[PDB]
């Protein structure tokens, strides 16, 4: 590839990843203006490139913010995963009387491969559905648990 | 605390985390039915607890799926962060002619503290706005970059 081709495919890679993430506050984020020279109404091959490199560097701050937000969600999901595991030990300890079903570890492995095999719209939808069904299940359980 | 109180506060902790994450496919997710004994129409202190422990264990599979999805988004955001850094080196190397502005590292540290200090609705909104402004900025830049 050449210079303009590596630029094109590198930007195409970044743009695809942004769409994968997307599924009052008066903040100043870099935008493209007419005087910046990136328009046909005054196209400057150098003035535009100065604005591009400047805007991306001024955008690089908010990219670190996004990684902190998505890491917080990763730490959030891992916390719900472990807090449920403790909730199992709490309930079985209070029971102490066991007709208990435990899922098959290899059946779960076959399901996780199938859940992640479908495309991104189905997986974003699956993530959307799992959250609602589990919260509704806990609210129904907690209500009956408080009646004791 | 007592037995029923530790159950209540542990579930309250899990339910809060699920709402923090929430901002065709025919999947079988555990639900609460009338015969399960968790309703007033037939309330069984033991039959309900058997369904609770069973449903949560059968839910524990889909909790591992959620952690894989949010980790994928964390790896996705970190990839956009590093791919932009390479895009800077690509553009400056093609320029080679420098009236370049580089942001202040401590000014960015003051902003990141303020961006994360606001509540979750503002931060989910800020995450929403940063993604749109950066993709629109790249599409405007790439268009002018292809005209060269």
């Amino acid at each position: 590839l050449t210079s303009s081709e590596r630029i094109d495919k590198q930007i195409r890679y970044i743009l695809d990843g942004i769409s994968a993430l997307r599924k009052e506050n008066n903040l100043n984020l870099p935008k493209m203006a007419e005087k910046d020279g990136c328009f046909q109404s005054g196209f400057n091959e150098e003035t535009c490139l100065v604005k591009i490199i400047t805007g991306l560097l001024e955008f690089e701050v908010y990219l670190e913010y996004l990684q902190n937000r998505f890491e917080s969600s990763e730490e959030q999901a891992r916390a719900v995963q472990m807090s449920t595991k403790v909730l199992i030990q709490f309930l079985q300890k209070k029971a102490k009387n066991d007709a208990i079903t435990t899922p098959d570890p290899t059946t779960n492995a076959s399901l996780l491969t199938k859940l992640q095999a479908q495309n991104q719209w189905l997986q974003d939808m699956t993530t959307h559905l799992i959250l609602r069904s589990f919260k509704e299940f806990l609210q129904s359980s907690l209500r009956a648990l408080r009646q004791m | 605390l007592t037995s029923s109180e530790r159950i209540d506060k542990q579930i309250r902790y899990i339910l809060d985390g699920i709402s923090a994450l929430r901002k065709e496919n025919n999947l079988n997710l555990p639900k609460m039915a009338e015969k399960d004994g968790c309703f007033q129409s037939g309330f069984n202190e033991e039959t309900c607890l058997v369904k609770i422990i069973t449903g949560l264990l059968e839910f524990e599979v889909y909790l591992e799926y959620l952690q894989n999805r949010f980790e994928s988004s964390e790896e996705q955001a970190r990839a956009v962060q590093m791919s932009t850094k390479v895009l800077i080196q690509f553009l400056q190397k093609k320029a080679k002619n420098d009236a370049i502005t580089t942001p202040d590292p401590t000014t960015n540290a003051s902003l990141l503290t303020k961006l994360q200090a606001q509540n979750q609705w503002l931060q989910d909104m800020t995450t929403h706005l940063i993604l749109r402004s950066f993709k629109e900025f790249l599409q405007s830049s790439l268009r002018a970059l292809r005209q060269m």
Partner: antibody
Amino acid sequence: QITLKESGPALVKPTQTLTLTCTFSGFSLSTSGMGVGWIRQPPGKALEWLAHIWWDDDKYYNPSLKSRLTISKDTSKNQVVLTMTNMDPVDTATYYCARRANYGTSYDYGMDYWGQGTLVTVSS
Amino acid sequence: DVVMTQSPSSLSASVGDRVTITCKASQSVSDVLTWYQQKPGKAPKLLIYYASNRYTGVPSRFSGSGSGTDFTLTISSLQPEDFATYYCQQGYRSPYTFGGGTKLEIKR
């Protein structure tokens, strides 16, 4: 459902204004990476790209016809208008408007949605 | 600014035959090239995008290839349904120039 439909006169006198209007439905021209272009085809001839307008009003034209070409948009009515003045019989053609979407991504299909096309005859 | 040239301008093949249509660019447009199929009078129908990636619904017998300045559209086993004119468009830089088009005729 995505629909683009051209509207305009089927007959224009020589040296008289031609006003074409493309009305679309199913997408917003204010969406990032979205754009609408104009392409014409003289009877039995090859295609010729005319003009294009992007979401940020950065208008582009074919360099040969920019003198008589003015494109503009109204995102509140979903309308893109291409205006040709001082029409000549050489510019009689079927005029299409097409949708360009997801410009920089791997889903830049190109002109993936077209209209039926309006046959424009120029004669007194 | 950019000139696309197609060869041949016309072609005639049998049913079940293979068709080869080429398109050249005056300057590199990377893989950002798009093929269209046009029936008489009707608006063009999208076939290939990004040189070698197939648009939704297009039969598997249509396959494009190439990059830079050499591009080729291939119809494996020709059906009589494929009677049309095939066009070549570069989407890299304005003007988004079309090719001359290749008129495909069916033999019998």
